[PDB]
Amino acid sequence: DLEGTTKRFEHLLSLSGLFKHFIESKKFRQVLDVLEENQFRESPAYVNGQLRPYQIQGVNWLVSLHKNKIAGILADEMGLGKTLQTISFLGYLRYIEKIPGPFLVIAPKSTLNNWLREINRWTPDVNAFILQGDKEERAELIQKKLLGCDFDVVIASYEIIIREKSPLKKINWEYIIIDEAHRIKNEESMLSQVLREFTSRNRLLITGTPLQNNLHELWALLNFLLPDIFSD
DNA sequence: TCAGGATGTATATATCTGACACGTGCCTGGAGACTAGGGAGTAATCCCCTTGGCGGTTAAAACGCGGGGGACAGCGCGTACGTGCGTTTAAGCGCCAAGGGGATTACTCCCTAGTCTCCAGGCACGTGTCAGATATATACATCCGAT
């Protein structure tokens, strides 16, 4: 809790810590009152295939954010290969960090199967167990796989996560990802409301249009990744 | 009948969200004079209602009979509902956008009500009447039960 909570603070102050408004105003005041006195440049191929030069630093940015243990949103534009740049990071955890699964692949219904198609083409031998279908084929799939604790990559749609919450609510998670995250722009939206209760270390959000309506929507995205940091 | 199905029916678990308990203040109910007018009690007058009995007229009501036709029981029968299975289709559920509608919440005034003060003139009551609605009779024309 506080070991990461404190460490993130001066790390924000470390890399251009020019905030000086909410880093100190934020009940974390007494927590920081204690301290108030004071890399894959080779297009690596652990995941199969070659990575074009401008795609790597994004992964290292994810790696650096992971190595610093803070969540981050990427804002690659449409058609730029966010799919590859997403699964590559998970390969980093599986290969370099040796932490395979569990993770979610919360995505639109249209792209449910699409990522799995792209998942295998750069990283075969993966545990992708998409949860989709009628009331039945989903149901028995819960016990054998979701309740079997034998997965690393879980694919489920916006509508699914609001249905199969009770299984996934029990399961602890490391990371949770949402593609085309802008549907989380109303912080009282029931899907956004449900995701508050999902236990995870950090979260990843993929978007191309973070700011669409106001600047108030950005904080709702920020309230999701780092609720402690912004919280208002 | 009995075994084959299909259908409620108890039962344990996990979820949750709705009922309940708790602190604040502000607003309303309570204490306490002060007063006036509604209502309780009284007296007087007159019309209606009671209880028990009597006498009379005269239509309705009670009773019996006979005969028809309407009811209720059966017998087909041929639909028109049921039951079941497959498959679309729409209800419901989320989400996006911007407004207007509305309900407090808080001052201001205008004006339009209530209150009083006379004072005439509407209206209710007690008097005639005569015109409309009776009851009478009769001729008729108009349905109903047998050829």
Ligand SMILES: Nc1ncnc2c1ncn2[C@@H]1O[C@H](COP(=O)(O)OP(=O)(O)O)[C@@H](O)[C@H]1O
């Ligand atoms: N380094 C690469 N080499 C070859 N193809 C790539 C590379 N990076 C991305 N792609 C392809 O470009 C496509 C871009 O898709 P993307 O925009 O990530 O989809 P989405 O918008 O649904 O996330 C992907 O389907 C992927 O196959």
Ligand SMILES: [Mg+2]
């Ligand atoms: Mg995409």
